[PDB]
Amino acid sequence: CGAIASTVPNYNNAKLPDPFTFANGTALRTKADWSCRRAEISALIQNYEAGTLPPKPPVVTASFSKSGNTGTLAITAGLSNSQTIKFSPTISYPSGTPPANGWPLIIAYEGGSIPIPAGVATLTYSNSDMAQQNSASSRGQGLFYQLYGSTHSASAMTAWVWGVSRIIDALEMTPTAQINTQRIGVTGCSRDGKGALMAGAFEERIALTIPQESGSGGDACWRLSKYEIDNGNQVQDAVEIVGENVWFSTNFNNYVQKLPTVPEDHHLLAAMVAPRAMISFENTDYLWLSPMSSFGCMTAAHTVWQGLGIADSHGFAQVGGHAHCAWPSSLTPQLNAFINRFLLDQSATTNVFTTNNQFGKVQWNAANWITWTTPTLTG
Ligand SMILES: *[C@@H]1O[C@H](CO)[C@@H](O)[C@H](O)[C@H]1NC(C)=O
Ligand SMILES: *[C@H]1O[C@H](CO)[C@@H](O)[C@H](O)[C@@H]1O
Ligand SMILES: *[C@H]1O[C@H](CO)[C@@H](O)[C@H](O)[C@@H]1O
């Protein structure tokens, strides 16, 4: 891919950054080009809003034990300077004999808030232990920072991603966990839905990503939410979110008032999942979630899957009429379709892209935000 850009000093675009053009002005043309564009997007997101995602450390070990239907995966991670941390997620297993290749698994941030089908194991990930997230007071606290240092630039969500990567490393080394590491999904609701999106985007071994009501800093776009808040919708936005918690790097503070200068938005974050599968779910009852911004953000991200000829690997379903993080039974068929196809190997059709258009004081106008023509990427 060559030397990937992590900063674009002269960038200034009030509309959504174009997925299909590299920072240097080179247009994407092949499906393989998307791998390099994803890597550039990774670098840009880390530089502007997420902080640094460390690579696998040189020590990662794991032991496993099981009591009844609950496994405990005891992980240790260590740096070359001997510093180490440990954490022990648990796994809830279906009973009986697993498939020949092991159970498909969903890594659920603090248990998630989706119903998980019977043939799928659930790993409960205590992401708040990995990086605290009470308020701005939490900056640099959590197991991640006991390894890398409390001034490490990673946001809380980037630290969470790191923990997921170590979990998957551990599973690959632990046959007795009886997990099919080729069929791992990730989910989370609300602030943990923001986290699940980051995990699926940055950790390519995740086969299915399921963010639930993730809102601002999740599947909503910064630029669209600024439009909402300026027009009287009481949405969460970039300016408020960096003061509320530590889900983003301290450096993001330098850009929340200057969003057009940021050469990325969360449509590119979501597009990092491609060519893997993702369906996110949103709720128009809570303007805090920035409903129009999520629909426009994911509509923009969808063009990447469309350009790759795999539109049905990316879903979006947005409805109203239920409490925050309550699962409406009306969406269970859509959720199960993605789980069935991408984790359970069924021939389920996954064409899901729906909203009720309940956006409050604004509307979605694609011509005001998307300026690119989706190319047909070759090869
Ligand atoms: C532009 O940047 C991309 C990503 O680093 C790279 O693959 C491509 O070769 C660059 N274009 C030129 C002409 O070097
Ligand atoms: C982001 O990272 C790139 C390398 O990918 C640097 O060149 C840049 O200065 C910034 O540190
Ligand atoms: C990209 O990022 C660098 C810092 O890494 C800035 O100096 C530059 O102006 C652009 O924001």
Q: Is residue 9 in contact with ligand 3, taking CB distance under 6 Å?
A: yes
Residue whose C-alpha is closest to residue 133's, from 91, 92, 48, 190? 190
Interval between CA 159 and ligand 1 midpoint (Å): 29
Phi and psi torsions of 115, nearest 5°: -75, 130
Tell me which of 190, 225, 249, 294 is the catalytic residue: 190
Q: Which ligand is nearest to the CA of 29?
A: 1
Phi and psi torsions of 119, nearest 5°: -85, 10
Burial class (CB in 10 A: 0-12, 13-18, 19+), 1: exposed
Query: Is residue 190 flagged as an active site residue?
Result: yes
Give strand ranges (E) for 261-301: 277-283
If you search the block for the tokens 């910064």, which residue do you land on?
222
Residue 61's DSSP bridge partners are: 76
Q: Whole-angstrom Cα distance, residue 246 to residue 254?
A: 14
1 CA: nearest ligand 1 atom: 7
* 1-379: CATH topology: Rossmann fold (3.40.50)
Interval between CA 250 and ligand 3 midpoint (Å): 14
Q: What one-character DSSP code corresponds to residue 30?
A: B
**Method by which the model was determined:** X-ray
Q: Which ligand is nearest to the CA of 48?
A: 3
Burial class (CB in 10 A: 0-12, 13-18, 19+), 338: buried
Q: Residue 318: CA atoms inside 13 Å, Cβ hemisphere, count?
A: 28
Max Cα separation, the chain? 59
Resolution, rounded to a tenth of an Å? 2.0
The residues spanned by each domain of the chain are: 1-379
